[PDB]
Amino acid sequence: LKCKKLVPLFSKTCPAGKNLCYKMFMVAAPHVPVKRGCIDVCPKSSLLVKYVCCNTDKCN
C-alpha cells in the first residue's frame, strides 16, 4: 500500500498498522486536496473538513 504524502512528490508505504489512505480537504472542492497521509482507522468527518478514506493504491 503506497500512497502520496502531504506533498504530491514523495510517496510512502503505510507501515504495519495502517492499511488505508486518508485525505483531508474542504467540503467544497473535492478536486482540491490539502493533506495526505496514511491511517488505520477512518476518523469521522465534520461540516468543515472532510476525511475520505480509500483502500486503493494512490487513492489520496
Q: Which amino acid is at 2?
A: K
Q: What CA–CA distance (Å, rounded) separates 36 from 20?
A: 11
DSSP per-residue string spanning 25-47: EETT-TT-EEEEEEESS-----S
- Select from 51, 48, 46 the least CA-distant residue to 20: 51
| Structural biology method used | NMR
CATH of domain 1-60: 2.10.60.10
Contact between 6 and 39 under an 8 Å Cβ cutoff? The reply is no
Per-residue burial over 16-42, b = 16 or more CB atoms within 10 Å of its CB, e = otherwise? eebebbbbbbeeeeeeebeebbbbeee
| The one-letter amino acid at 58 | K
Closest to 10 in 3D by CA, of 44, 33, 45, 37 = 37
Which grid coordinates belong to 20? 488505508
